[model samples]
Target: HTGSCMAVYSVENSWSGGFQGSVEVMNHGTEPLNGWAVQWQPGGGTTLGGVWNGSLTSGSDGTVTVRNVDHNRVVPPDGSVTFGFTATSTGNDFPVDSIGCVAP
Candidate 1:
């Protein structure tokens, strides 16, 4: 089968001003993924605070990029890795629009 990755985004917790969330990168191919990246549009006015299990980078267009850390780079077939973050949202809801993933 062709190599594929799926990005599952979730909001683990939330509050009035901010929230915590995570993304699970699942590898569905027969081979392992040496590395991976996830991309998404954060909720408007969302400011990222901290992240773990991945590195974080953002663009001016509200697109956030998450790359696997050294320890989490390898994901075997049918396996997954998760990364989490805290962010400040302008509203009470957490935005996780257009979430997607790819191999690296």
Candidate 2:
């Protein structure tokens, strides 16, 4: 009865050569989602500035992985999880796509 989730990526704001964005992980099942992890590439050579609510890992191939911290590991049914990050790129617009979310 656990698992089942969706992730939505959106930009909160933007500036020259950079932008602020967020990912909302939505729970779509009856059970509480636990121990979730989110992964994605910033894309277009965009680099991370910081993530507010999770532990983040930078990949050698320009990908990034974000995992829930202690306080946010369990998400109740129909409730969603969220985190925001900042990045700068050589070009404008958020190139991030297909964010991966998992829980167990």
Candidate 3:
């Protein structure tokens, strides 16, 4: 089963057709997480460009996954970590639809 967590995704900055966004993941489980990953379907043909504090994997079907990097993977219970990314879109929308997180 996937570990319990909360994820808040938001756009930090934006231009005409691109934006920078960040996701904050908070652990709500009893035990600490050695690593975590968040996955979602992004809107407006969004493609991730760069990321910090995590590793990114984007599929051709517009599904994206971001996992914790080496330094910030260990998340103690009730603790949180934030990761930021730059993305480009065909349209001027930065929507993170159907996002879910799991601790691994």
| Per-candidate local distance difference test | 0.72, 0.70, 0.73
Q: Which stretches of candidate 2 lie over 4 Å from their true place?
A: 1-3, 29-34, 70-78, 96-100
Q: What tens-digit string does per-residue lDDT give for candidate 1 at 1-104?
A: 46677778888998988998888876665556665677777776777777887787777875777775555536443567777888887763677464768776
> Which RMSD values do the candidates have, in order?
2.9, 3.3, 2.9
**Candidate 3 segments whose C-alpha is farther than 4 A from its true place:** 1-3, 73-78, 96-98
Clashing pairs in 3: none
| Backbone steric clashes in candidate 1, count | 0
Q: What is the lDDT of residue 53 in candidate 2?
A: 76
Instruction: Please identify which of the two predictions, 2 or 3, would achieve the higher lDDT against the true structure.
Output: 3
Q: Give the per-residue lDDT digits (tens) of candidate 3, residues 20-101.
A: 8888877676665665787778776667788888788887775777886555536543567788888888874577554657
Give the best candidate by lDDT: 3
Q: Which candidate number would show the highest TM-score if scored against the true structure? A: 3
Q: Rank candidates, TM-score, best first.
A: 3, 1, 2
lDDT by residue (tens digit), candidate 2, 1-104: 44476788777998777888778877664555556767777767577677787766777976766766444546544567788877777864576565657665
